[PDB]
Amino acid sequence: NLAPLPPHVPEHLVFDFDMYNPSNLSAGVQEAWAVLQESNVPDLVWTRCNGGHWIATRGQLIREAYEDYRHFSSECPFIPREAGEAYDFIPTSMDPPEQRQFRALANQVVGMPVVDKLENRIQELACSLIESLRPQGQCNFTEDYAEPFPIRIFMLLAGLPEEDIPHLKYLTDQMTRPDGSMTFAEAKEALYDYLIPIIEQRRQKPGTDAISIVANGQVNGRPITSDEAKRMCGLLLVGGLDTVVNFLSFSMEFLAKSPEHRQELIERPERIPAACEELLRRFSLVADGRILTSDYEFHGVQLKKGDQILLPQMLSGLDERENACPMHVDFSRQKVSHTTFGHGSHLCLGQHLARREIIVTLKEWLTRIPDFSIAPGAQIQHKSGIVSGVQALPLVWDPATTKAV
Ligand code: HEM
Numbered sequence: 001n002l003a004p005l006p007p008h009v010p011e012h013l014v015f016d017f018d019m020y021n022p023s024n025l026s027a028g029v030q031e032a033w034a035v036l037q038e039s040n041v042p043d044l045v046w047t048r049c050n051g052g053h054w055i056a057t058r059g060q061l062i063r064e065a066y067e068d069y070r071h072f073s074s075e076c077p078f079i080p081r082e083a084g085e086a087y088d089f090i091p092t093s094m095d096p097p098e099q100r101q102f103r104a105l106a107n108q109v110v111g112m113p114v115v116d117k118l119e120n121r122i123q124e125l126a127c128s129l130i131e132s133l134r135p136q137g138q139c140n141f142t143e144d145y146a147e148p149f150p151i152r153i154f155m156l157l158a159g160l161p162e163e164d165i166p167h168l169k170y171l172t173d174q175m176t177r178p179d180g181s182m183t184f185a186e187a188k189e190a191l192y193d194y195l196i197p198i199i200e201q202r203r204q205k206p207g208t209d210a211i212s213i214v215a216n217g218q219v220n221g222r223p224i225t226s227d228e229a230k231r232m233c234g235l236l237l238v239g240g241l242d243t244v245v246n247f248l249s250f251s252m253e254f255l256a257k258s259p260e261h262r263q264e265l266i267e268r269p270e271r272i273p274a275a276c277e278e279l280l281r282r283f284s285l286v287a288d289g290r291i292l293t294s295d296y297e298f299h300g301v302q303l304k305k306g307d308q309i310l311l312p313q314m315l316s317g318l319d320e321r322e323n324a325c326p327m328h329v330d331f332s333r334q335k336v337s338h339t340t341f342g343h344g345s346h347l348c349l350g351q352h353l354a355r356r357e358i359i360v361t362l363k364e365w366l367t368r369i370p371d372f373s374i375a376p377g378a379q380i381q382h383k384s385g386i387v388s389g390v391q392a393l394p395l396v397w398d399p400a401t402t403k404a405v
């Protein structure tokens with residue numbers, strides 16, 4: 001289902017990529033996207049899928065676009081347009097200078113100092129979850145660890161009941177990897193119906209949770225409104241529920257297939273941080289975009305006001321001009337170049353938390369379960385969207401090769 005080509009698009013720039021269902025999805029999600037970086041593909045293409053939109057394919061262009069908020073606005077950051085239209089999360093749907101105030105607040109909640117405070121709990125939950133799995137010689141990593149781990153940490157931070165997980169997770173999944181079961185706005189609404197009462201409650205009787213801090217915060221000398229808190233909290237929710245969860249699965253799928261990479265980390269633990277960055281490059285998973293604010297000629301292509309452009313954060317690090325042998329995992333790369341956490345003014349606030357969660361998982365998993373693999377005859381399915389994911393991750397191991405701590 002392709003849309004008719006707008007008058008301003010040269011037919012030689014057409015490349016029909018479906019960000020929701022790329023063609024060689026079988027090969028893996030990062031591999032499916034990397035088709036865009038083949039020699040036959042121009043740096044900047046137009047796809048007729050998902051209503052028609054530009055896609056920058058090279059790291060240089062993605063970064064430039066990301067820096068350029070004047071021309072590339074966050075007002076409508078998701079494709080298809082109706083999704084980008086319906087989304088009003090803060091600070092994501094704002095451009096500087098306005099963004100800055102909201103950012104400053106969200107930072108209060110997720111930032112470095114918070115992670116530092118939460119460190120022991122992160123370590124505590126990881127150890128507990130792993131130890132619980134160890135003796136079984138088999139899990140569903142996606143349901144068994146990748147979900148509970150990051151989610152429970154978020155739930156704790158946000159001061160929300162664990163019981164709400166299944167419902168929230170569903171709504172979140174609808175936003176990034178739409179199923180066809182709702183509509184973006186419907187999804188957004190359901191999430192907001194959830195949040196409203198909680199916010200009201202935390203305005204009246206504040207706590208120490210993230211929601212309380214956002215609900216009662218200051219923005220540009222005055223108090224945040226109820227609508228604004230709702231909108232910030234909505235973003236925090238998607239970030240907490242849908243990001244780290246998918247990343248861990250890609251990473252774990254790779255480790256399960258590469259004994260030598262596992263060993264490397266076991267013997268030379270000083271490499272973990274470095275390996276964390278490398279995996280963030282190779283298994284990058286986010287793709288969003290921007291909206292043209294005016295007619296603008298970018299790298300010789302004419303962009304028209306209102307055109308949307310996908311600037312796949314995923315792609316920068318997979319770009320050969322950025323990293324030699326992109327698809328190869330090397331923990332000793334001299335320079336790991338990625339924009340996994342974004343670029344420009346919208347740099348991920350939650351990066352510190354995400355990194356802490358990754359490093360803890362690697363260290364702790366390898367400590368206890370040094371030797372594992374994918375279950376025989378299991379076919380791993382990746383899913384594409386705004387955030388890409390792994391459907392399920394059947395792992396097996398010999399309990400006798402594990403180590404209790
Ligand atoms: C592996 C994990 C994650 C990845 C790859 C990731 C990626 C990104 C990307 C690419 C952006 C910028 C989007 C844009 O420019 O439109 C973003 C922004 C953001 N992320 Fe994340 N994120 C992750 C985890 C988290 C977590 C755990 C949270 C916290 C709950 C979080 C909170 C945020 C916020 C608040 C922003 C908006 C910053 C702003 O607009 O100023 N993220 N993230």
Ligand SMILES: CCCCCC[C@@](O)(Cn1ccnc1)c1ccc(Cl)cc1Cl
Nearest residue numbers: 078083092175176238239286287288386
């Ligand atoms: C229709 C869009 C579906 C919801 C987007 C999810 C997320 O907000 C959360 N998140 C992600 C990272 N941190 C929080 C995101 C994903 C990718 C990008 Cl590029 C930006 C944003 Cl805001």
